[PDB]
């Protein structure tokens, strides 16, 4: 499961959960589906080569399901855990057996941000 959090120009914040298998990356031109197995959208170090577009087959936004929802990850954005990001984009199921829990309550509800 991947949780995507987005915001609008009016300050409304929408968080939606999507199963990993519903992702489908697009080519750099956005006019076709990029091969899931061999997809080149991450630089050598891990960042995005270009703004990556991915189509979700089914997205549940505000309790309403929609078909073929296209979303974008701007190149001007930090990418954490490039392996996990690539797996989510390609639709793989990530094995999280080797996991640790860090207790850091650094985020408050409705926390402010620069995305306004």
């Amino acid at each position: 499961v991947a949780k995507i959090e987005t915001q609008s120009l009016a300050g409304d914040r929408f968080t939606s959960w999507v199963e990993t298998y519903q992702f489908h990356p697009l080519t750099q031109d956005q006019k076709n589906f990029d091969n899931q197995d061999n997809a080149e959208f991450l630089e050598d170090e891990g960042q995005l080569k270009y703004e990556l577009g991915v189509q979700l087959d089914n997205l549940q936004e505000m309790g309403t399901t929609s078909q073929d929802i296209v979303i974008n990850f701007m190149k001007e954005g930090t990418v954490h855990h490039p392996e996990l990001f690539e797996a989510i984009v390609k639709g793989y199921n990530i094995d999280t057996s080797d996991y640790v829990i860090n207790t850091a309550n650094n985020l408050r509800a409705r926390e402010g941000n620069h995305n306004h």
């Binding site: 996991y99 640790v100 829990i101 207790t103 850091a104 650094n106 408050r108 509800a109």
Partner: protein
């Protein structure tokens, strides 16, 4: 997964800390972060089994918090009671319970609505050694709480900087300019 494994060698991870920073460096009640290692997976998972994960320390909500000497960070996001402070005359040696959540019905002082609203912001109990007039914060974001430190001006500036706040402010501005222009053009 062959491609992902091949690229994992040169892939690099980045820190997951953002503008909000770390709460333990600004909140005395937030313990420093600690990593907990899960135990080995259970060979048999009984239907009525309980978690074996190591326990995490539980910190209950305090009734009130002391005065942070200019190093106050609210536990939650408080309601903006007002955009300018209250010029209140405080008595010498009298304990005051300044409201942190921002919904108090008794003014700057705590009224009890913190216990009825879902928030980790607790009233600040403080005392003053010299009676006189003080500017008590109303936006509830002052770092020198309960005392105002002109953070309301920066809050107003951020509201104006926001796309929707800019629209609201200037829509009201042009609404008043409507009256101004009607008065200016009244005679024709």
């Amino acid at each position: 997964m062959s491609a992902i494994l091949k690229r994992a060698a040169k892939y690099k991870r980045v820190s997951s800390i953002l503008c909000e920073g770390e709460a333990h460096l600004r909140d005395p009640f937030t313990p420093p972060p600690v990593i907990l290692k899960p135990p080995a997976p259970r060979k048999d998972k009984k239907p009525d089994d309980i978690t074996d994960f190591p326990a995490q320390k539980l910190i209950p909500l305090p009734e009130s918090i002391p005065y942070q000497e200019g190093k106050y960070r609210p536990a939650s996001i408080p309601m903006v009671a007002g955009f300018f402070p209250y010029n209140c005359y405080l008595q010498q040696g009298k304990v005051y319970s300044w409201c942190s959540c921002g919904i108090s019905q008794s003014g700057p002082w705590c009224d009890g609505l913190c216990n009825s609203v879902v928030t980790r912001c607790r009233p600040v109990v403080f005392n003053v050694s010299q009676s006189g007039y003080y500017k008590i914060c109303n936006c509830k974001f002052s770092a020198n709480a309960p005392f105002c430190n002109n953070t309301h001006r920066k809050m107003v500036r951020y509201h104006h900087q926001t796309h929707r706040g800019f629209y609201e402010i200037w829509g009201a501005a042009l609404f008043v300019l409507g009256w101004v222009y009607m008065g200016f053009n009244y005679y024709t």
